[PDB]
Design a protein around this ligand. Sequence first.
Ligand SMILES: *[C@@H]1O[C@H](CO)[C@@H](O)[C@H](O)[C@H]1NC(C)=O
Ligand SMILES: *[C@@H]1O[C@H](CO)[C@@H](O)[C@H](O)[C@H]1NC(C)=O
Length: 92
Amino acid sequence: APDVQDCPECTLQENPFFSQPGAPILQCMGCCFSRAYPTPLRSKKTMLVQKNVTSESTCCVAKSYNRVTVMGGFKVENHTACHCSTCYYHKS
Ligand SMILES: *[C@@H]1O[C@H](CO)[C@@H](O)[C@H](O)[C@H]1NC(C)=O
Ligand SMILES: *[C@@H]1O[C@H](CO)[C@@H](O)[C@H](O)[C@H]1NC(C)=O
């Protein structure tokens, strides 16, 4: 691709704190790319209807965690797995 749209590939960003010769904690951080597709609808009311987002801020709430609460009681849910989308409350 031309570039990276200033966004990496959603995943774990190994804890730059807990990372030690035997324990490289994490913290899912990145971008899960985007999947948009324009479609010529009808739009009842004004030119547009209701509010809609471009959809890109995908959430990969670690599918699985190995949580290793660090400094200030951090929580890297020592991510063992990360799955974009599916959050505790989408649309916000
Ligand atoms: C965190 O999870 C990764 C992947 O399973 C593992 O390699 C690492 O040892 C874990 N870190 C700790 C402190 O358990
Ligand atoms: C979002 O709303 C705008 C309103 O103008 C519309 O043009 C666009 O097609 C909508 N996007 C999607 C994915 O429906």
